[PDB]
Amino acid sequence: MFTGLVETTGKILEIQETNEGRGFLVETKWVQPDLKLGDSISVNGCCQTVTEFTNEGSRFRFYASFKTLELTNFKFLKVGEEVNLERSALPTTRLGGHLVSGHVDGTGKILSKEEREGGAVICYTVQNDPSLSRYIAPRGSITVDGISLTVVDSRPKEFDLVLIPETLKKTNAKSWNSDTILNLEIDLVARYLEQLLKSKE
């Protein structure tokens, strides 16, 4: 369970191919580093489980199945690459952010960029499998490389985003260009709503 509000980023240091997937070592500076062997982390919007930590979390390793490699943008991660981090949410009477599973529903490539109001707002357009189009509502939410964002408009086969760079500098969004590929988690809320309707007949 996550809010899709990225705490910080980390640098991929190391990658071991193995007979059942890829083995990532990552470095970062957490606020109040609490990492425990086992606890969950949304790496670019993708929940991964901690198999080791090397400095009460300052470094930590996780392991991605061949499947998580085909499901997500993880296939393309290179040593050194900056990555979005969010630990599972804590109990708090102040609930903020969105409802984020950290379960990638497929991927999307950047089609267009634009800088309206002279670099106050960045206008991305992103390709989506049309099976997802149903879950992607204008003025609705979505979680892109683990960054919770509001869809501005959606078409079949694409949708539009706008960002304040008060997100772009504090995340991996800095290095979004060309088509450089994004993990998409559609709004769970939508999935649940849809299910309540189906079950009425």
Residues of the shown chain interacting with its own copies in the complex, contacts defined by CB under 8 A: 1, 3, 20, 34, 36, 38-40, 49, 65, 67, 87-101, 103, 105, 117, 120, 130, 133-141, 150, 154, 156, 164, 166, 187-201
Tell the smallest beta-carbon distance from residue 29 to its own copies (Å). 14
Query: Considering beta carbons, is residue 78 or 198 the nearer one to its own copies?
Result: 198
| Angle value at C-alpha 164, between 162 and 167, nearest 5 degrees | 110
Per the CB < 8 A criterion, the answer to whether 104 and 184 are in contact is: yes
Tell the smallest beta-carbon distance from residue 97 to its own copies (Å). 6
Query: Considering beta carbons, is residue 13 or 170 the nearer one to its own copies?
Result: 170
Neighbours of 143 (CB within 10 A): 30
DSSP H helical segments within the chain, as ranges?
66-71, 130-133, 165-168, 188-198
Tell the smallest beta-carbon distance from residue 197 to its own copies (Å). 6
Query: Considering beta carbons, is residue 44 or 48 the nearer one to its own copies?
Result: 48
Query: Considering beta carbons, is residue 49 or 180 the nearer one to its own copies?
Result: 49
* Euclidean distance between CA atoms 148 and 107, whole angstroms: 15
Tell the smallest beta-carbon distance from residue 147 to its own copies (Å). 13
* Euclidean distance between CA atoms 144 and 147, whole angstroms: 5
Structure token digits, residue 137: 């509502």
Tell the smallest beta-carbon distance from residue 154 to its own copies (Å). 7
26-44 in b/e form (b: 16+ CB < 10 A) is: bebebeeeebeeeebbbbb
Query: Considering beta carbons, is residue 13 or 101 the nearer one to its own copies?
Result: 101
Tell the smallest beta-carbon distance from residue 200 to its own copies (Å). 5
Query: Considering beta carbons, is residue 15 or 190 the nearer one to its own copies?
Result: 190
Tell how far CA 43 is from the center of its chain: 7
